[PDB]
């Protein structure tokens, strides 16, 4: 009747964007950056080795002071670390062991975690008593939780496996917004530098930049073959690198609206579990499942380092707010802290 | 420093509680509970007693954790690796769904959908050496159905005989033939009783045999 003409009307808007995209694809960025300096063999060394998790580490996140960090692990523990002296500031017991994400609040007052129980639990660090206790639990998701990210002390955004992201108000404890555009499970978030947008990659190999105050998908980014496992934002705020089970990672752009650089290698047939950018946005760091975190020179598409100290797959990694350290927690139950020497 | 010596002294109070909790959680038996849906999973939880439903049913000096991922309408390949170190996997299959069709698309009648899932759980690369416990759930209901209709709508290559104890030579052996890793697993099989002993005693007896053969692979003798 008309549903198969709207099958044609749907692709009528898709091929129009195709010719608008390769027209503004006037030059590949690698032939402009033929003249820039390759950074050389980035060599880092495990300065600290944070040990005390007893199962797979599924997520970690740094505090904003670049010194405290939280790590989540499959043994149902959330540990606050002093990365300077490897000594544990807090260990938080979780209500469900199956935890796939964790976040640190930008004030450091709060830490979130969530996972297969479809709840982002919010924990209060700086109590007038001595303990860390649960502020609010955020129920309302249908699939598992993949990534919690605080905007401030009262607003957190969570992605889930029900194809929906969601903005929350932690005070009332209920989602002010809900972001429904994806068709597969959303697997990772990263908030913007100015925290007025975010972007989420899903199991349908698509990425979608959102608006936290409007509530709808600004742009939609394709280019991957298999599921997207890892988003982080570039420090500019106008790029983000997706890390896939396709054994590839690609760099995007919101103002250009297509993939620009893809970071792969033919000896790498193993899928990316984590992505993070450096302070200059010159070292994409990515944690693979050939057991070693690779360190990608993000401007040139040639791997410039490897943090090969891990006995199982590298599930999480984060560069600090001053670019000084890098942790790579992993499935061998250790976080290792990497800083390159002169 | 003085205060830095009381922060170090605190972190090894944290450390000896992450060690005390983690040697009380290696003495626990973790068990995935999979299945086809309406396949008697809800029955055996009521015997052995919104996302994960971790059921803990510690009964004979051995602490069990059973994780029912039932309402996880999402891609299974994206969260199944969390259960990699798991002792066994309890799998339910409805015997009465032999000639009973599935309600999806009138495909192969609701046990080739169970057998499609069993082949995806046996040969899964996280379950290379996690031996699956198999339950055959609706034993009473298909005997009244095997007298009315033969076991040819599901398996047309069967022998016949229309008998209650015949279908073990049809149904159980068909599922244990899907075990492509015949040397690293075992597919311990059962017929779900309606008594309190012989459906959770089997879960205790056949999970000790996972533990014994996990020690022999740890102590070199295997």
């Amino acid at each position: 009747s008309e549903l198969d003409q709207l099958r044609q009307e749907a692709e009528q808007l898709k091929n129009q964007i195709r010719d608008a995209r390769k027209a503004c694809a006037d030059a590949t960025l690698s032939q402009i950056t033929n003249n820039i300096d390759p950074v050389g063999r980035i060599q880092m060394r495990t300065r600290r080795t944070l040990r005390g998790h007893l199962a797979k580490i599924y997520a970690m996140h740094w505090g904003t002071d670049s010194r405290l960090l939280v790590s989540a692990s499959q043994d149902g523990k959330l540990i606050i670390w002093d990365s300077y002296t490897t000594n544990k500031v807090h260990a938080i017991p979780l209500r469900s062991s199956w935890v796939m994400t964790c976040a640190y609040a930008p004030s450091g007052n709060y830490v979130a975690c969530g996972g297969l129980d479809n709840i982002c639990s919010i924990y209060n660090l700086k109590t007038r008593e001595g303990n860390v206790r649960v502020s609010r639990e955020l129920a309302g998701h249908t699939g598992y939780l993949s990534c919690c990210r605080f905007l401030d002390d009262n607003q957190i955004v969570t992605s889930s496996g029900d194809t929906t992201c969601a903005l929350w108000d932690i005070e009332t404890g209920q989602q002010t917004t809900t972001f429904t555009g994806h068709t597969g499970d959303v697997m990772s978030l990263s908030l913007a530098p100015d925290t007025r947008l975010f972007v989420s990659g899903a199991c349908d190999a698509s990425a979608k930049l959102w608006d936290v105050r409007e509530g709808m998908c600004r742009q939609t980014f394709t280019g991957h073959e298999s599921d997207i496992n890892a988003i982080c934002f570039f420090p500019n705020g106008n790029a983000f690198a997706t890390g896939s089970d396709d054994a590839t990672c690609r760099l995007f752009d919101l103002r250009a609206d297509q993939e620009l650089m893809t970071y792969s290698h033919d000896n790498i047939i193993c899928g990316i579990t984590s992505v993070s950018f450096s302070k200059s946005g010159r070292l994409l760091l990515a944690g693979y499942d050939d057991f070693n975190c690779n360190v990608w020179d993000a401007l040139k598409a040639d791997r410039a380092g490897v943090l090969a100290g891990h006995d199982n797959r590298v599930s999480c990694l984060g560069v600090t707010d001053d670019g000084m350290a890098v942790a790579t927690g992993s499935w061998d139950s250790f976080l290792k802290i990497w800083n390159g020497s002169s | 420093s003085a205060e830095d010596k009381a922060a170090v002294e605190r972190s090894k109070m944290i450390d000896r509680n992450l060690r005390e909790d983690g040697e009380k959680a290696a003495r626990e038996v973790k068990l995935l509970l999979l299945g086809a849906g309406e396949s008697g999973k809800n029955t055996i939880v009521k015997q052995m007693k919104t996302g994960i439903v971790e059921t803990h049913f510690t009964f004979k000096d051995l602490h069990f954790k059973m994780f029912d991922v039932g309402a996880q309408r999402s891609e299974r390949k994206k969260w199944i690796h969390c259960f990699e170190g798991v002792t066994a996997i309890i799998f339910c299959v409805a015997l009465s769904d032999y000639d009973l069709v599935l309600a999806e698309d009138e495909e192969m009648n609701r046990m080739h959908e169970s057998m499609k899932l069993f082949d995806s759980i046996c040969n899964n690369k996280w379950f290379t050496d996690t031996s699956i416990i198999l339950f055959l759930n609706k034993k009473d209901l298909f005997e009244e159905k095997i007298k009315k209709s033969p076991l040819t709508i599901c398996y047309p290559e069967y022998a016949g005989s229309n008998t209650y104890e015949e279908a073990a030579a049809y149904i159980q052996c068909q599922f244990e033939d899907l075990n492509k890793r015949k040397d690293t697993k075992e597919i311990y099989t059962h017929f779900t009783c309606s008594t309190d002993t012989k459906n959770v005693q089997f879960v205790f007896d056949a999970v000790t045999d996972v533990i014994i053969k996990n020690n022999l692979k740890d102590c070199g003798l295997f």
Partner: single-chain antibody, 233 residues
Amino acid sequence: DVQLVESGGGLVQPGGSRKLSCSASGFAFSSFGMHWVRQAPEKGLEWVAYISSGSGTIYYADTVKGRFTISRDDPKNTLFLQMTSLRSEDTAMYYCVRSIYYYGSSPFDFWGQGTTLTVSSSDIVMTQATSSVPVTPGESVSISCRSSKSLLHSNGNTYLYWFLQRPGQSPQLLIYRMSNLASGVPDRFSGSGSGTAFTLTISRLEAEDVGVYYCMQHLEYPLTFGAGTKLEL
């Protein structure tokens, strides 16, 4: 909220014994280090003892070390001090101080109301050479004291602590580790300094900011106090 209240003592003959207990309620007492601090009549404060959280590290005051005994019991949530062979310098009001040490905590913040004990008959020095200052509400006050050793440590902080004891009240942490304001203090107070000389500033005086303003160190034990700096109205 948080509440420490201690018992035991008041009048004892000299050469005797006394058991001071401190009942804690409102916080996670098994996760806190616990001090005792005394204050003799019309004198300053003087640190008495210490237990680390988990009873691993016990210090004492080198004045009466080996005479006193500090103990805690976490399932009871009390803090004990056994004081035996009691002299005449032991006459003081004894306070129960709460203190927690991790990265970024505020030690020495909650002080109990106290109990009194009367009878009938090297290390760093903190010097507040000013004894009292006449001051009118509204102006900027600046209190200063001196140390013997440099209080700055090689890890980066400066263990100088400030406290205000209002008249008829208990001490109250204002600034911990030379700069950082405590919880619930008004923003008018501020702390500063460099190395061995420090300056506590108030910007606006109010009627409850009168009292005696002490300065403590915490760089190594003993936690030596100084004589106080009075502000009267």
